[PDB]
Write an enzyme that holds these catalytic residues in place. Structure first.
Site, mmCIF file in Angstrom:
data_model
loop_
_atom_site.group_PDB
_atom_site.id
_atom_site.type_symbol
_atom_site.label_atom_id
_atom_site.label_comp_id
_atom_site.label_asym_id
_atom_site.label_seq_id
_atom_site.Cartn_x
_atom_site.Cartn_y
_atom_site.Cartn_z
ATOM 1 C CE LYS B 44 53.574 64.264 48.111
ATOM 2 N NZ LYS B 44 54.129 62.978 47.571
ATOM 3 C CE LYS B 46 48.744 61.478 47.486
ATOM 4 N NZ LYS B 46 47.947 61.983 46.328
#
Lengths: 115, 113
Positions: B44, B46
């Site tokens: 993601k 992240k």
């Protein structure tokens, strides 16, 4: 009811704090956390990222925390212990010896793996 | 037993999170948190400060959280809902509409502000 207490700022909690709290609560049936106010936090030469209220809210949401009270200064411990019927006083290892004066009022315990 | 679930990374855990979680748990009798694994975080785009285990331990310590399971990918929700007998699916406002496809399997709820 074996009541335990511990002081601190508890600003950006990292599982490290949770471990300390759990171990502390583990020594009794009720755990009190004396959260450093932002004014005293300043006195301690710190400027918390999270304000008192927010820090309080987070602590209260922790399974092991039964009550959060404000720590407004250095000389309230003895009083707190009596006022809240505290049986056990817990702090991290880095405070070892720093609060022995409470030994005559309650059980003083300095944890180990509390970096 | 009205079982609720919610997904997320929950890295630098603080009160905003707590607010969502409490609200979530409030809609049922049991709250499940599908914690994004560290691998899925990279997926993601992240990177968390706290690793999955540490993030998991912190969530578990929260009074509102009854179970934490690993979220390994985007397409496990439908499966999770069935596998864990999820009754209500909750997510933040910023996900509104993004998971309506679960509406036919459980109650989908997007928290407000």
């Amino acid at each position: 009811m074996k009541r335990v207490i511990t002081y601190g700022t508890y600003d950006l909690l990292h599982y490290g704090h949770i471990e300390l709290l759990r171990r502390a609560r583990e020594m009794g049936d009720y755990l009190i956390v004396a959260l450093s106010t932002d004014e005293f936090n300043q006195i301690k030469h710190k400027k918390s990222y999270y304000d008192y209220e927010q820090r309080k809210m987070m602590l209260e949401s922790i399974r092991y925390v039964d009550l959060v009270i404000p720590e407004k200064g250095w000389g309230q411990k003895e009083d707190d212990v009596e006022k809240f019927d505290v049986d056990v006083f817990v702090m991290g290892h880095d405070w070892e010896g720093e609060f022995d004066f409470l030994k005559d009022k309650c059980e003083v315990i300095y944890l180990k793996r509390t970096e």
